[PDB]
Design an enzyme around this catalytic site. Structure first.
Site, PDB file in Angstrom:
ATOM      1  N   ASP A  34       0.784  -1.142   0.000  1.00  0.00           N
ATOM      2  CA  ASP A  34       0.000   0.000   0.000  1.00  0.00           C
ATOM      3  C   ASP A  34       0.838   1.220   0.000  1.00  0.00           C
ATOM      4  OD1 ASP A  34      -2.714   1.661  -0.070  1.00  0.00           O
ATOM      5  OD2 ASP A  34      -2.171   2.020   1.903  1.00  0.00           O
ATOM      6  N   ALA A  35       2.042   1.355   0.654  1.00  0.00           N
ATOM      7  CA  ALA A  35       3.064   2.469   0.793  1.00  0.00           C
ATOM      8  C   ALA A  35       3.984   2.930  -0.405  1.00  0.00           C
ATOM      9  CB  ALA A  35       3.900   2.266   2.028  1.00  0.00           C
ATOM     10  N   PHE A  37       3.062   2.580  -3.568  1.00  0.00           N
ATOM     11  CA  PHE A  37       2.316   3.317  -4.535  1.00  0.00           C
ATOM     12  C   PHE A  37       2.411   4.768  -4.293  1.00  0.00           C
ATOM     13  CE2 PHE A  37      -1.298   5.541  -5.985  1.00  0.00           C
ATOM     14  CZ  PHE A  37      -1.274   5.227  -7.281  1.00  0.00           C
ATOM     15  N   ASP A  38       2.526   5.145  -3.066  1.00  0.00           N
ATOM     16  CA  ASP A  38       2.484   6.533  -2.726  1.00  0.00           C
ATOM     17  C   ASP A  38       3.713   7.263  -3.084  1.00  0.00           C
ATOM     18  OD1 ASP A  38      -0.055   6.246  -1.084  1.00  0.00           O
ATOM     19  OD2 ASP A  38       1.274   4.497  -0.726  1.00  0.00           O
ATOM     20  N   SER A  84     -14.592 -17.736 -38.630  1.00  0.00           N
ATOM     21  CA  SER A  84     -15.427 -18.643 -37.932  1.00  0.00           C
ATOM     22  C   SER A  84     -15.212 -20.032 -38.472  1.00  0.00           C
ATOM     23  CB  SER A  84     -16.837 -18.209 -38.157  1.00  0.00           C
ATOM     24  OG  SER A  84     -17.007 -16.984 -37.574  1.00  0.00           O
ATOM     25  N   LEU A  85     -15.699 -21.030 -37.801  1.00  0.00           N
ATOM     26  CA  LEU A  85     -15.483 -22.381 -38.231  1.00  0.00           C
ATOM     27  C   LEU A  85     -16.595 -23.026 -38.963  1.00  0.00           C
ATOM     28  CD1 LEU A  85     -14.072 -24.130 -35.121  1.00  0.00           C
ATOM     29  CD2 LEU A  85     -12.997 -24.017 -37.287  1.00  0.00           C
ATOM     30  N   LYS A 116     -14.717 -28.227 -28.010  1.00  0.00           N
ATOM     31  CA  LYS A 116     -15.199 -26.985 -28.383  1.00  0.00           C
ATOM     32  C   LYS A 116     -15.923 -26.384 -27.243  1.00  0.00           C
ATOM     33  CE  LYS A 116     -17.807 -24.770 -31.987  1.00  0.00           C
ATOM     34  NZ  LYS A 116     -18.899 -24.110 -31.259  1.00  0.00           N
ATOM     35  N   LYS A 293      -8.568 -30.033 -36.244  1.00  0.00           N
ATOM     36  CA  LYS A 293      -7.719 -29.248 -37.052  1.00  0.00           C
ATOM     37  C   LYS A 293      -6.588 -29.999 -37.601  1.00  0.00           C
ATOM     38  CE  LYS A 293      -8.499 -25.527 -33.910  1.00  0.00           C
ATOM     39  NZ  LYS A 293      -7.857 -24.508 -33.109  1.00  0.00           N
ATOM     40  N   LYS A 317     -20.268 -30.816 -34.310  1.00  0.00           N
ATOM     41  CA  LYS A 317     -21.167 -30.409 -33.327  1.00  0.00           C
ATOM     42  C   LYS A 317     -22.081 -31.497 -32.932  1.00  0.00           C
ATOM     43  CE  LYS A 317     -21.816 -25.875 -33.251  1.00  0.00           C
ATOM     44  NZ  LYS A 317     -22.872 -25.552 -32.306  1.00  0.00           N
TER      45      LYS A 317
HETATM   46  C1  LIG Z   1      -0.677  -1.637  -3.732  1.00  0.00           C
HETATM   47  C2  LIG Z   1      -1.430  -0.445  -4.297  1.00  0.00           C
HETATM   48  C3  LIG Z   1      -1.601  -0.236  -5.610  1.00  0.00           C
HETATM   49  C4  LIG Z   1      -2.255   0.849  -6.038  1.00  0.00           C
HETATM   50  C5  LIG Z   1      -2.784   1.730  -5.195  1.00  0.00           C
HETATM   51  C6  LIG Z   1      -3.563   2.934  -5.680  1.00  0.00           C
HETATM   52  N1  LIG Z   1      -4.137   3.943  -4.832  1.00  0.00           N
HETATM   53  C7  LIG Z   1      -4.545   3.904  -3.463  1.00  0.00           C
HETATM   54  O1  LIG Z   1      -4.566   2.970  -2.917  1.00  0.00           O
HETATM   55  C8  LIG Z   1      -5.064   4.927  -2.486  1.00  0.00           C
HETATM   56  C9  LIG Z   1      -5.993   5.884  -2.711  1.00  0.00           C
HETATM   57  C10 LIG Z   1      -6.102   6.573  -1.549  1.00  0.00           C
HETATM   58  C11 LIG Z   1      -5.208   6.002  -0.683  1.00  0.00           C
HETATM   59  N2  LIG Z   1      -4.613   5.043  -1.270  1.00  0.00           N
HETATM   60  C12 LIG Z   1      -2.614   1.494  -3.906  1.00  0.00           C
HETATM   61  C13 LIG Z   1      -1.952   0.430  -3.451  1.00  0.00           C
END
Ligand SMILES: Cc1ccc(CNC(=O)c2ccc[nH]2)cc1
Length: 321
Positions: A34-35, A37-38, A84-85, A116, A293, A317
């Site tokens: 989550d970190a 990305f920031d 198509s076949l 198929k 085929k 078919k």
């Molecule tokens: C691992 C991962 C990938 C992409 C993102 C994208 N944006 C957010 O999460 C976000 C929006 C507001 C707070 N956080 C997050 C985390």
């Protein structure tokens, strides 16, 4: 700086950032922490301050935090015509197809036999191992763009895996079928009805609908699958046969069925057809036939194709009931 390096950096970073916005918002499947990305987003912002020409209304930073991901089904061309076949519904018809194949080529043709699947045909294009486009069949030349929707399918990888024996091609156009397994079809219907929505009459209709969503997040939460069963335009890959092509697809991470067999003559084709007539009910998804085929690539080239169909394959078919 270097203005070319400025542009290089921006594109790469915007690409990485946009891909992660997609994974987090459209899918619920983030792949970084989550970190992490920031930091990335900061940098890209950090990056457009210096060079304000880079910030456009289409940039991952400005104008698209949360959104910008929609499918509009716009026409996109296939690299190679997606035909198509032709179908065979009776034993004489198949024999007649086989006879004609054996009037053109000899015993040199072997027959790949696959199940198929009664689903929705999807065409994927991979450029340098990266998925760039996903498309519906359309008219054979042009289909509709559902790339984002395809990007949510678990079975479809974004990137291809570097093979040992199989190097990733520069361009790979691969075809397949998108479908629901029976249990999931039922399950989705329940969920839909639970929100006061109408359920689907069959799994093919359900898959088509699930794929065709303007908002691809809808598609992401539906359990759609895909099996690849054909190749279109390719560069950097020259497989001698279709069975061998499936080995490279597997190596690279594309989904392939486990029910394909290679037969040497019509008698062998006939056994599989008979067998699956008796065993298709045990498969967890819908099988409405068997596709036969000619395995050799060079033989399929000689045989060619008509305006509407290939002459080196035919779909047997089964009776509907
Ligand atoms: C691992 C991962 C990938 C992409 C993102 C994208 N944006 C957010 O999460 C976000 C929006 C507001 C707070 N956080 C997050 C985390």
């Amino acid at each position: 700086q270097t203005a070319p390096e400025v542009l290089r950096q921006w594109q790469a970073l915007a690409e990485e950032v946009r891909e992660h916005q997609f994974r987090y918002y459209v899918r619920d499947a983030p792949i970084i922490s989550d970190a992490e990305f920031d930091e990335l987003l900061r940098r890209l912002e950090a990056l457009e301050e210096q060079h304000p020409e880079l910030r456009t209304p289409d940039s991952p930073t400005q104008l698209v935090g949360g959104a910008g991901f929609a499918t509009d089904f716009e026409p996109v061309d296939h690299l190679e015509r997606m035909l198509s076949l032709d179908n065979a519904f009776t034993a004489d018809e198949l024999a007649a197809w086989a006879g004609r194949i054996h009037a053109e080529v000899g015993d040199a043709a072997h027959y790949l036999c696959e199940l198929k699947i009664d689903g929705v045909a999807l065409s994927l294009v991979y450029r340098e191992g990266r998925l760039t486009r996903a498309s519906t069949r359309g008219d054979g030349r042009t289909g509709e763009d559902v790339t984002l929707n395809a990007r949510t399918i678990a079975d479809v990888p974004e990137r291809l895996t570097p093979g040992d024996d199989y190097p990733v091609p520069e361009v790979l156009e691969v075809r397949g079928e998108v479908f629901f397994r029976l249990d999931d079809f039922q399950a989705l219907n329940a969920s839909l009805v639970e929100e006061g929505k109408a359920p689907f009459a069959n799994p093919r209709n359900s898959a088509a609908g699930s794929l065709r969503q303007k908002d691809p997040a809808v598609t992401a939460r539906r359990r759609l699958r895909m099996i690849c069963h054909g190749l279109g335009h390719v560069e950097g890959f020259r497989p001698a046969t279709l069975h061998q092509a499936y080995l490279a697809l597997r190596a690279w991470g594309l989904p392939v069925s486990e029910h394909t067999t290679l037969a040497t003559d019509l008698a062998g084709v006939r056994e599989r057809i008979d067998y699956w007539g008796e065993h298709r009910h045990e498969v967890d998804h819908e099988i409405d036939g068997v596709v036969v085929k000619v395995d050799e690539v060079a033989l399929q080239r000689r045989l060619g194709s008509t305006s509407r169909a290939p002459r080196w394959a035919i779909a047997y078919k089964y009776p509907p009931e």
